[PDB]
Curated annotation (Swiss-Prot), chains A, B:
The keyword Transferase does not apply. Its EC number is 3.2.1.147. It seems that the absence of a catalytic proton donor in plant myrosinases is not impairing the hydrolysis of glucosinolates. It comes from Sinapis alba (White mustard). Glycans are attached at residues 19, 58, 88, 216, 242, 263, 290, 341, 344, 359, 480. It catalyses: a thioglucoside + H2O = a sugar + a thiol. This is Myrosinase MA1. It comes from the Eukaryota. InterPro entries: Glyco_hydro_1, Glyco_hydro_1_AS, Glyco_hydro_1_N_CS, Glycoside_hydrolase_SF. GO terms for biological process: carbohydrate metabolic process. The active site is at 407 (nucleophile). Substrate binds at residues 37, 139, 184, 328, 455, 462-463. L-ascorbate binds at residues 185, 257. Pfam families: Glyco_hydro_1 (PF00232).
Length: 499, 499
């Protein structure tokens, strides 16, 4: 019987009690990254994360930081591979920058051969060290030209441009890459990019945020989500029909959270909690498993929810070989009003739930996850058991999928000095406590989880936060980014992998 | 009789001998700037100078500097107006960033009302202090979307997109702005943007520079130059036919140089010198005054030179109310081969001339203008009399135009400390020596020059050089850009203006 801790102090950092041998022998362990966050702009065209961070610098992060140079993995990709080789990692998730291989967005306008060569060399280097690539085609960095031509994922023109981009990736790299991710965290762009305007492209209703250049927070998240599912599904169909000879697998990436009732004896809070599962996970997993949105979304969202045609439903349903599940935290849910006629209505209000980290009796769900210095009542707290709950739920509700955990990690403050930053025991605690629960759910519930990629390989630009927080298992000095030095967490993870 | 100095030391910095009263009473004196160089990216879309500087950082400048934040005239426009008010300037040349008012390039895609408001407030503030705006519609900062859709000025689609942009500017600002410039320095984008790839967008033949993403240095400069003339002319026609009620004037900006023979008794050098006038100035002034390219260009460039249709010739010919002439230096010309079949052929070789600052007997043309630290044999030297020669030539060859000198200035090294940077006596010498010759040519040749705008109002990002050189008459500290402090040159210029 496996027992895992939920509260500090944790004791799972002792590799005598928890290590890679605790898991099946074929289980993949590694780390993850994304292109905007690590490469720099050298050698690529511009994308909407360059656009957004430069047009709205106070949204890029409190330091106004951006991905212009970051850790310079364009130049130092080899040092990334060396970190992985030090860890004895068997997997690495990275993303291809669309703007590096097709700077003009539309494939017919030409490809960047040097960009293609950059990824060829990375892939070859990973394979030579025994590292399996997990490659994200789209980690939010849409070529700016596409957002300016037709507002990107707001328009159905995105589908064929994304399809032609993916086809190029499969043709150039699919002989070596066998695990593809389509769109990173399906929920995020619709809500943050087109609802709250916290992320690129930065669209929203005028009274939500007067700085947005355009938008409608009540309708656009649904339009964008719908086009994401269609573009994803078109790419999966293309892969499965035209690249089956490569013997690979493809899937979407979901951001997952677990939800618990703010008051577990209050039927209204219990109902809000179930609505949150449907509106947060089911918005995408209903279409992916059944070709339809959840009925509660159909009922609440009404005319603002697009319909799939029979052909589209068939394309979307079953459009995955596996799921990349990212998991960071869990929230308590209580009822909240849904003012659909307010000018500041957002799609996020449709779930009729308010989310917190503290329940009605005052219990904080778990240890600190992210301090909010402007507002401490907005701190985020984590919940190790949530990874168990999420995986169990996906097996039970969503037809026993093959899963890879494609992101899991925690930040530390950018104000810490180097010594403090390297002594990242809070990161060991977070990673180990989640890995304990992950092993427990695999053993107890028989969830088909086959790998785990911790967020992040090294310190990088964090969307919305600049360089004010660090997520790496390896440390990068912003005054001289060449080296990636394993932190205590990286050193721990090395021992966990090879105990 | 007016006597002006050509060599150090200069004595024209004494406002007892040379001041604004030396010129006609209506003569306009001020300074100039451009949007990419001073505003920052906040509040605007992305353009090809953001694209080029980020994709090719070592081409942005030796420090990899760019216009991301620069002197922050987005926030500190008022401080610009305060510099002008301190100088008692009567003119200011600035440019409108296309990407600030139409971030999506094509006007039908929507306008940025806040961007429009930014220029409204600047214009209103200048007029309230008695400063006449001279507004450049296009100072090289093409929206990136247009370069990605159709390669910008390489394609004739540019004409209508530029026309619709200009129409928006005339409609919103033309009730207050009475002096418009269309395209800054017509010669520069074709040659540096599409020939040598020193400037955005960075296209050239593969063997000229392997880093270019695409191009053809032998043909594209001519295509781009042709489209620039057509787009310019379409905008002038639009202005003169639809905005005549505003009672303003419009014209192009030329970069001018004078040319002298490397050996003034050698017929081959003399011929190369006359070819340079035609290929450098006549490339654009032939079309602007006669609707045709110079015959030497027709003969040499052959099938690589586009033809104007009769309708186009008529549109281009006479398409100016005045000329904005920029002037910095003069070169000696000697013959050089034109290897049209070489894979590294460039349009610039078609003139059959090699340019230097030293003549065949070893005479340097004038004082130092720009030190080149990698290569001292590549230093640039200036020649005060060249402004006299250029203005005389334009009056004689080009039908006695109305002229405004829209840029004239000199850099100092960015390595100098603040104290050294403020003690910019070499800038007083450069400005005064040119102003002496300008007054002399107006009096002796009766050239219709009606204003002078010195480059630059304040320190800014310099195309190709980052922040490694300074051109301002006012100093900006890059660690805290709010203030613009008049340097010795600014203080001199203040006394010259109000002696
Ligand atoms: C898995 O996908 C399956 C579909 O492949 C989901 O089942 C479909 O569920 C929908 C409800 O979402 C049912 O559709 C209703 O059909 C009524 C019956 O119509 C049929 O007979 C008529 C009935 O009187 C008739 O007019 C119609 O022409 C057919 O003859 C409808 O009236 C319902 O429409 C009303 O409600 C809609 C909101 O639900 C609203 O948008 C419509 O305007 C209308 O007010 C609905 O009809 C649908 O109307 C919209 C139109 O665009 C659709 O094409 C039309 O079908 C389906 O009949 C049912 N299909 C079958 C094959 O079962 C399944 O839903 C789950 O299971 C069903 C049993 C139900 O309990 C759902 O609540 C639950 O979500 C999806 N599973 C999951 C887990 O999501
Ligand atoms: C100011 O603009 C005026 C035009 O508005 C320029 O004058 C034009 O100059 C061109 C030369 O550039 C002369 O065109 C030549 O016409 C010959 C005569 O053709 C007429 O009679 C025929 C002659 O035998 C006949 O086929 C033709 O159909 C007419 O009947 C031509 O053969 C020349 O073409 C050859 O040379 C071209 C290069 O110059 C080459 O590109 C052609 O392939 C061909 O080999 C030329 O014909 C031109 O051919 C190209 C075609 O696209 C043009 O439409 C076609 O005209 C013009 O006759 C002359 N027009 C008039 C109204 O004078 C003027 O040029 C300056 O002045 C003229 C006198 C000449 O000295 C030029 O060298 C000098 O540049 C421009 N001024 C300035 C200062 O640039
Ligand atoms: C977890 O949720 C439960 C279920 O909602 C909370 O228990 C309920 O708390 C209500 C108070 O918020 C109780 O109602 C009140 O009962 C007192 C005694 O009769 C009465 O004077 C009140 O005016 C009030 O009555 C309601 O008034 C509004 C009407 O619309 C409604 O019909 C009335 O019910 C309610 O009885 C109680 N329900 C149960 C099943 O116990 C629970 O609240 C926490 O426990 C209750 C026992 C009470 O001690 C609360 O003070 C305490 O907050 C909530 N838990 C937390 C920690 O918030
Ligand atoms: C300014 O340009 C002028 C005109 O081109 C230069 O003067 C010319 O310089 C040529 C030498 O580069 C002289 O030709 C030479 O004459 C000597 C004496 O006969 C002879 O031995 C040479 O081999 C050579 O002759 C030429 O050989 C090549 C044949 O294709 C050609 O037909 C021959 O002419 C030429 O006479 C002279 N022309 C004139 C009109 O004086 C001038 O060069 C400078 O001055 C000349 C006098 C001489 O002192 C050069 O050393 C000195 O460089 C050049 N000025 C500068 C400063 O470069
Ligand atoms: C968001 O777009 C929706 C749909 O166009 C707008 O909601 C409509 O508002 C129009 C004008 O009131 C109403 O007539 C419709 O009944 C509403 N339609 C539905 C689908 O709700 C909404 O006003 C726009 N919001 C913003 C802030 O512009
Ligand atoms: C530049 O474009 C020109 C015109 O397309 C190319 O020059 C031609 O080269 C083709 C192939 O040799 C020749 O057949 C033509 O005679 C040339 N045409 C003329 C107008 O010169 C040139 O090769 C291209 N340069 C680059 C480097 O691609
Ligand atoms: C690995 O952890 C398991 C418990 O799952 C333990 O039994 C085994 O000894 C550990 N391996 C090492 C080398 O410490
Ligand atoms: C498959 O590739 C072939 C050849 O390029 C193409 O005709 C077909 O439409 C492609 N399709 C998909 C997504 O099935
Ligand atoms: C608008 O929304 C903000 C946040 O959603 C909320 O605090 C405020 O009450 C809302 N106001 C109206 C008029 O609904
Ligand atoms: C930067 O870091 C690299 C690797 O540690 C080091 O070799 C190089 O000398 C450092 N550069 C400077 C300027 O210190
Ligand atoms: C790498 O991991 C493999 C598989 O578990 C192991 O046998 C090998 O010893 C490890 N290497 C190091 C250097 O840890
Ligand atoms: C201005 O310069 C002129 C010479 O052009 C001189 O005569 C006049 O006195 C000067 N004005 C002042 C105020 O110094
Ligand atoms: C003038 O404006 C009118 C009305 O918008 C338009 O019809 C006409 O084509 C414009 N033209 C130019 C450039 O003359
Ligand atoms: C190519 O050009 C460079 C500069 O134009 C020149 O130095 C070199 O000789 C040229 N080579 C050939 C093969 O023409
Ligand atoms: C920056 O310069 C402005 C103007 O001189 C000054 O008022 C402000 O205090 C300075 N900021 C800092 C941080 O020194
Ligand atoms: C401004 O220039 C005008 C015109 O020459 C002059 O009369 C006025 O005194 C000057 N003001 C200052 C403060 O120099
Ligand atoms: C930050 O930026 C936006 C403009 O992009 C501006 O509307 C807003 O006031 C600024 N936010 C704060 C809190 O300063
Ligand atoms: C600078 O950048 C380009 C890539 O953009 C590269 O080809 C070239 O080698 C670099 N230049 C130098 C001298 O390092
Ligand atoms: O739940 C979530 O976790 C991540 C991030 O907030 C973790 O730092 C994210 O993008 C979500 O929507
Ligand atoms: O002659 C020229 O002067 C300027 C610049 O070099 C002055 O710094 C330029 O853009 C030209 O082509
Ligand atoms: C997963 O979350 C990490 C932590 O916030 C982000 O850096 C990744 O880009 C996101 F995909
Ligand atoms: C005129 O030249 C100045 C000096 O190089 C540049 O800064 C301007 O942008 C150019 F238009
Ligand atoms: Zn930048």
């Amino acid at each position: 019987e496996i027992t895992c801790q939920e509260n500090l102090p944790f004791t799972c950092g002792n590799t005598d009690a928890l290590n890679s041998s605790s898991f099946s022998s074929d289980f993949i362990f590694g780390v993850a990254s994304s292109a905007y966050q690590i490469e720099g702009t050298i050698g690529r065209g511009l994308n909407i994360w360059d656009g957004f961070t430069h047009r709205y610098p106070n949204k890029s992060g409190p330091d106004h930081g951006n991905g212009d140079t970051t850790c310079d993995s364009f130049s130092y990709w080899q040092k990334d591979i060396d970190v992985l080789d030090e860890l004895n990692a068997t997997g690495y998730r990275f993303s291809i920058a669309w703007s590096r291989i097709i700077p003009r967005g539309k494939r017919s306008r030409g490809v960047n051969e040097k960009g293609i060569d950059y990824y060829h060399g990375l892939i070859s280097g990973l394979i030579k060290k025994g590292i399996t690539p997990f490659v994200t085609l789209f980690h939010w960095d849409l070529p700016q030209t596409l957002q300016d031509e037709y507002e990107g994922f707001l328009d159905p023109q995105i589908i064929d441009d994304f399809k032609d981009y993916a086809d190029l990736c499969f043709e150039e790299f699919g002989d070596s890459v066998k695990y593809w991710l389509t769109i990173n965290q399906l929920y995020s762009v619709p809500t943050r990019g087109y609802g709250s305007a916290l992320d690129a492209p930065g669209r929203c209703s005028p009274t939500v945020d007067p700085s947005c250049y355009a938008g409608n927070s009540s309708t656009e998240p649904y339009i964008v989500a719908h086009h994401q599912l269609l573009a994803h599904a078109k790419v999966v169909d293309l892969y499965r029909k035209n690249y089956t000879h490569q013997g690979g697998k493809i899937g979407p990436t979901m951001i997952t959270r677990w939800f618990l009732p703010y008051n577990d004896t209050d039927r209204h809070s219990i109902a809000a909690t179930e609505r949150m599962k449907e509106f947060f996970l089911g918005w995408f997993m209903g279409p992916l498993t059944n070709g339809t949105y959840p009925q509660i979304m159909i009922d609440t969202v009404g005319e603002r929810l697009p319909s799939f045609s029979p052909e589209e439903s068939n394309l979307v349903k079953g459009s995955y070989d596996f799921l990349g599940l990212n998991y960071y935290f869990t929230q308590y849910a209580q009822p909240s009003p849904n003012p659909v006629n307010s000018t500041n209505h957002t799609a996020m209000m449709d779930a009729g739930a308010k989310l917190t980290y503290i329940n009605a009796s005052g219990h904080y769900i778990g240890p600190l996850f992210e301090k909010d210095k402007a507002d401490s009542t907005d701190n985020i707290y984590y919940y190790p058991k949530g990874i168990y709950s999420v995986m169990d739920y996906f097996k039970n509700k969503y037809y026993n999928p093959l899963i890879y955990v494609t992101e899991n990690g925690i930040s530390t403050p950018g104000d810490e000095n180097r010594n403090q930053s390297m002594l990242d025991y809070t990161r060991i605690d977070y990673l180990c406590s989640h890995l304990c629960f992950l092993n427990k759910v695999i053993k107890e519930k028989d969830v088909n989880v086959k790998g785990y990629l911790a967020w992040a390989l090294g310190d990088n630009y964090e969307f919305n936060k600049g360089f004010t927080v660090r997520f790496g298992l390896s440390y990068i000095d912003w005054n001289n980014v060449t080296d990636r030095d394993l932190k205590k967490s990286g050193q721990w993870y090395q021992s966990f992998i090879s105990p």
